[PDB]
């Protein structure tokens, strides 16, 4: 939407170049008075596993970022990574800064922008705010 995420100055000024790491989350920027290597955020995912087998994440595959979904009912061998095993989950209204299922499975919480919205475990109707 090209809306300003941040403006950064440093007391180095005149920023000539940019480049980005191809494996991602470091960008480095060349200035008149020096160079800086900078580290960008998001290093880790937000998700939670309840007891209903709705393990909910945001982003990823068979889930959108804006909406909320995910399920994981698979128990295949401990030695490898298990499939996504997602089942579809209803409405959301906010972005997931952190998105989490209830630890015993009755609530879902999506948190975002100074607000939390509560959606119901497997029905996803707005429970609470």
């Amino acid at each position: 939407t090209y809306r300003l995420e941040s403006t950064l100055n440093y007391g180095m000024e005149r920023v000539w170049c940019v480049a980005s790491l191809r494996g991602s989350n470091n960008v480095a920027l060349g200035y008149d008075e020096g160079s800086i290597i900078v580290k960008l955020g998001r290093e880790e995912p937000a998700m939670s596993m309840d007891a209903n087998g709705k393990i909910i994440w945001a982003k990823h595959s068979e889930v959108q970022q804006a909406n909320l979904k995910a399920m994981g009912d698979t128990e295949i061998k401990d030695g490898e990574r298990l499939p996504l095993a997602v089942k579809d989950m209803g409405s959301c209204e906010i972005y997931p800064q952190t998105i989490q299922h209830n630890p015993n499975g009755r609530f879902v919480v999506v948190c975002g922008d100074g607000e939390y919205i509560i959606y119901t475990a497997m029905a996803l109707r707005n429970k609470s705010f």
Partner: protein
Amino acid sequence: VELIYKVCHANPSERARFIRCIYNLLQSSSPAVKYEAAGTLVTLSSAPTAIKAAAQCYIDLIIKESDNNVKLIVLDRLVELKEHPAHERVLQDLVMDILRVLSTPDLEVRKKTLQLALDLV
């Protein structure tokens, strides 16, 4: 004047003596898992494949202390990286597969690696 009662108290000097002092207080079946010895040790074979090949040897040794028959020579400690639970995720054996080699890494590392597959299992 060397040997401290402490962990340290600071600075490279104290730190260098300290790994000597640690080897004393646990000599038993090599260092196993190398202490502050690791830092100088890489430069000791800067030419270049020989470091990995060596490193691979220690990592294999460390996994387990097996029966130690003909080319089953892994020393160090018996349990410290186990081998082979069926609930362990994503398992020990993944690292063990590297050691089985056709050349899968380069030849110096290869010769070390084939012996090392034989040695753990």
